[PDB]
From Swiss-Prot:
Protein name, UniProt field: Allograft inflammatory factor 1-like
Function, as annotated: Actin-binding protein that promotes actin bundling. May neither bind calcium nor depend on calcium for function.
Entry's localization field: Cytoplasm, Cytoskeleton; Cell projection, Ruffle membrane
Subunit structure as annotated in this protein's UniProt entry: Homodimer (Potential). Monomer.
Parent sequence residues shown: 16 to 125 of 150
Disulfide pattern: none
Membrane topology listed for this record: Peripheral membrane protein
Amino acid sequence: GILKARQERRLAEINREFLCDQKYSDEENLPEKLTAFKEKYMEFDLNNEGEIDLMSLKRMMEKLGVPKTHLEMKKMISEVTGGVSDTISYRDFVNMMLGKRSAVLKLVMM
Ligand SMILES: [Zn+2]
């Protein structure tokens, strides 16, 4: 409970940083999209760092009824992180959701 409430205020701080980021100065409905992405990201069982790891993905694909193998999950993450981290951070998740590049995880969400 306390873990999740402090998780979301950490995500809220990040959203507030995006609301002021000149990169997204274009985006229409930005406050709304960011709220929705925070709620979606909060649906994962995040790791000790508050990030989506192999475990978080596994649990999510299973809740959603979508079969993924070890390697497919590995690839779903490196695809979204461009291969520089083995976990998806909220920043990476938001940039994924806003970005025009397609991603298996982005397409799995919807
Ligand atoms: Zn604050």
